[PDB]
Amino acid sequence: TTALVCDNGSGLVKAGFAGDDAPRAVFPSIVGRPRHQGVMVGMGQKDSYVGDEAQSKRGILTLKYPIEHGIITNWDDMEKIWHHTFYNELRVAPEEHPTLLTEAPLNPKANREKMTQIMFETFNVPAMYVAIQAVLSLYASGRTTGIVLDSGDGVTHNVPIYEGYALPHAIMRLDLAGRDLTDYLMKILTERGYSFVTTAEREIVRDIKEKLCYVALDFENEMATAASSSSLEKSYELPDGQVITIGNERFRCPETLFQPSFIGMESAGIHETTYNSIMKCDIDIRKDLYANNVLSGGTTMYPGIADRMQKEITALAPSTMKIKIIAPPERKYSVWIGGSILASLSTFQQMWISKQEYDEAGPSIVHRKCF
Amino acid sequence: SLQKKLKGTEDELDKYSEALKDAQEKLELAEKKATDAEADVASLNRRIQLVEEELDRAQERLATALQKLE
Amino acid sequence: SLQKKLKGTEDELDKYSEALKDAQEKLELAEKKATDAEADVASLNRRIQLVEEELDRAQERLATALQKLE
Ligand SMILES: Nc1ncnc2c1ncn2[C@@H]1O[C@H](COP(=O)(O)OP(=O)(O)O)[C@@H](O)[C@H]1O
Ligand SMILES: [Mg+2]
Numbered sequence: 001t002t003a004l005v006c007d008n009g010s011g012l013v014k015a016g017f018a019g020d021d022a023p024r025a026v027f028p029s030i031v032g033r034p035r036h037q038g039v040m041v042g043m044g045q046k047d048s049y050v051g052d053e054a055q056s057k058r059g060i061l062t063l064k065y066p067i068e069h070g071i072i073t074n075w076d077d078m079e080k081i082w083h084h085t086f087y088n089e090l091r092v093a094p095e096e097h098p099t100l101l102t103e104a105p106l107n108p109k110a111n112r113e114k115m116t117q118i119m120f121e122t123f124n125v126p127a128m129y130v131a132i133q134a135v136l137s138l139y140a141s142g143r144t145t146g147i148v149l150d151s152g153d154g155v156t157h158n159v160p161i162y163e164g165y166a167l168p169h170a171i172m173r174l175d176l177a178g179r180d181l182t183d184y185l186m187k188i189l190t191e192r193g194y195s196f197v198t199t200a201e202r203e204i205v206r207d208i209k210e211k212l213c214y215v216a217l218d219f220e221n222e223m224a225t226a227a228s229s230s231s232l233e234k235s236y237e238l239p240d241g242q243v244i245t246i247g248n249e250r251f252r253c254p255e256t257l258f259q260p261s262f263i264g265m266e267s268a269g270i271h272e273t274t275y276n277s278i279m280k281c282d283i284d285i286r287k288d289l290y291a292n293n294v295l296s297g298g299t300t301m302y303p304g305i306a307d308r309m310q311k312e313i314t315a316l317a318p319s320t321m322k323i324k325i326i327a328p329p330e331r332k333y334s335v336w337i338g339g340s341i342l343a344s345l346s347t348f349q350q351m352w353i354s355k356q357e358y359d360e361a362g363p364s365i366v367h368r369k370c371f
Numbered sequence: 372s373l374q375k376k377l378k379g380t381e382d383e384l385d386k387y388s389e390a391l392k393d394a395q396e397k398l399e400l401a402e403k404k405a406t407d408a409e410a411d412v413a414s415l416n417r418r419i420q421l422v423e424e425e426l427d428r429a430q431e432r433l434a435t436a437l438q439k440l441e
Numbered sequence: 442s443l444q445k446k447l448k449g450t451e452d453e454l455d456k457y458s459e460a461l462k463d464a465q466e467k468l469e470l471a472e473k474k475a476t477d478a479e480a481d482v483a484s485l486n487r488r489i490q491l492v493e494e495e496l497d498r499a500q501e502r503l504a505t506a507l508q509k510l511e
Binding site for chain 2: 443447450451454457458460461464465467468471472474475478479481482485486489492493495496499500502503506507509510
Binding site for chain 2: 214303307
């Protein structure tokens with residue numbers, strides 16, 4: 001048989017068979033419902049629209065995200081998302097396919113318990129497993145040591161790993177992610193005169209952020225340059241025409257990662273959290289952690305993020321140490337690649353959670369050695 | 372009598388519309404290439420200043436170690 | 442009637458012709474900027490390796506001087 005690798009993530013569901021080079025189906029994790037009445041008779045529109053289908057009908061629907069920060073809030077629509085992924089995008093019955101999932105570090109145990117219960121009862125998969133996103137990302141890069149930063153749309157966390165041995169006491173998890181950056185961009189575009197309120201226009205703001213924003217190596221110098229020069233403004237075309245322009249907001253939005261005080265967060269920037277997590281570890285492994293800094297996640301795809309992060313870490317770390325940041329082109333798909341590699345291993349075949357084993361041991365077995 | 376004039380006008384309109392559409396398509400292609408090149412060159416210019424500072428204080432502490440060896 | 446539509450079509454065709462001329466102008470400007478950026482990046486990425494080897498042997502005899510001083 002073959003294994004199935006599913007990555008629920010947050011804001012983008014990516015799934016595909018184990019052993020493939022890239023995920024087969026990638027679509028937003030969005031479930032929508034029509035807020036209007038509808039006058040045409042015989043149309044027979046169904047109650048709920050899920051996946052990329054709801055994106056095309058954005059103007060009529062309202063969008064709800066079942067995942068806020070890693071955790072799942074609404075479970076019925078989560079079941080709808082999983083059913084859609086299993087039946088329409090992959091067109092495969094999950095009755096004969098083991099399923100591997102990704103789960104962010106430091107999340108409630110009830111999340112894992114309900115996930116396993118749903119996957120074993122509703123879909124009756126023969127076996128399934130849950131793995132950490134950072135470990136899979138380290139699998140994809142081909143490394144075996146080094147501290148990995150996984151900044152997705154839901155949560156940003158650092159996991160220091162040395163020689164295949166994780167250090168749980170040095171794991172730091174931060175709630176700043178892509179969704180908060182999009183919300184801050186919405187809040188900051190009001191200054192120029194553009195107002196976005198409807199959840200449909202959240203997607204437009206997200207597209208603007210993806211296609212236009214960039215990270216500045218130096219902040220005050222860039223502010224001084226933009227206050228006089230006009231070479232930074234770029235124009236974007238809304239779906240209904242009405243071209244707009246944007247200036248300082250082009251690079252002010254991604255600065256929130258390094259300046260959490262912009263959105264009122266107390267914590268420090270990612271550049272400081274990475275250094276603090278490195279210093280929380282031992283002293284004999286800091287060379288490899290410094291020299292094998294790995295980036296991943298969609299939010300990392302900002303151009304110029306690597307240079308700024310390296311500059312900050314070098315400004316923090318001692319000058320003797322060599323600081324290297326690994327930024328593969330396929331950052332946002334690294335976790336799924338690592339999951340496919342992990343599920344394709346021969347020695348992993350005896351680490352699944354079987355059906356009868358779960359039945360006899362109950363849902364609490366997830367937290368046992370079968371982590 | 373005017374039917375031929377209308378047909379010719381329609382054909383000309385179609386021809387200029389196709390030429391214009393090709394013109395945009397090339398314009399977005401060239402613009403995307405230009406922005407990608409500009410981003411790449413700006414990033415590597417920033418690399419240039421950082422390696423320049425690297426090199427500068429490299430000769431700084433090299434010279435300091437030089438008189439130390441003296 | 443048909444005369445109004447023909448006049449409107451002619452005026453629109455003139456407008457899109459002006460837009461076409463602007464499109465080629467912008468394309469030419471973008472191409473010039475692209476080739477200038479290509480020359481700049483060529484110079485920069487043939488000087489980066491010189492800077493790299495420079496700092497390399499800088500730290501090399503930094504280490505030699507340090508060990509001799511010790
Ligand atoms: N090039 C990019 N520019 C800006 N943001 C990006 C880019 N690529 C991905 N993202 C952000 O990453 C988020 C999706 O993260 P992803 O890598 O799919 O993991 P997850 O689905 O678990 O969040 C999106 O919300 C998006 O805003
Ligand atoms: Mg992720």
